[PDB]
Design a protein around this ligand. Sequence first.
Ligand code: HEM
Length: 154
Amino acid sequence: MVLSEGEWQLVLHVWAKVEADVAGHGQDIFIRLFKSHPETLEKFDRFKHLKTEAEMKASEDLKKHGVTVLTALGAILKKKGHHEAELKPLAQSHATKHKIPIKYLEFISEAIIHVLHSRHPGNFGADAQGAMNKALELFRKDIAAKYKELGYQG
Ligand code: HEM
């Protein structure tokens, strides 16, 4: 699949807002993910002990992790589709070291959309959300293709 320049512009416009506070967006996204799909928390040995949202918000390590994840996702989005190089190491670590099913990538994509919708309604209308969903589906499609090449079905 391919996004038009117009769709990329909608994606990058709202992402520019996210970049005004990466750490804050990272926390909301992971808390949303862990609360909506608790099973995903079991994949993080470093955070699986967190019991409440209060504990999650207070975790310095979780906040730092969120910045690392969003920064990588941002680098990929800014390539506007030409992200083959950025995807390689990401796909290998998540398929071989962390063992993350495509299903879980769908869950975090939902968390991202939810948080952007909550925080940036003025820059995340129907068209912009459609553009973001398309960019995330492209991301998941390409990561899935790499998973297969690497020998991981998940
Ligand atoms: C938006 C998609 C995602 C991106 C861009 C992303 C990015 C990253 C990055 C950059 C790291 C650190 C470097 C590395 O280990 O490769 C990381 C670590 C990790 N990711 Fe992801 N990730 C994504 C989705 C997920 C999902 C959905 C899970 C599973 C619920 C997951 C589980 C992990 C784990 C377990 C680690 C190691 C954390 C640690 O022990 O420090 N990731 N991810």
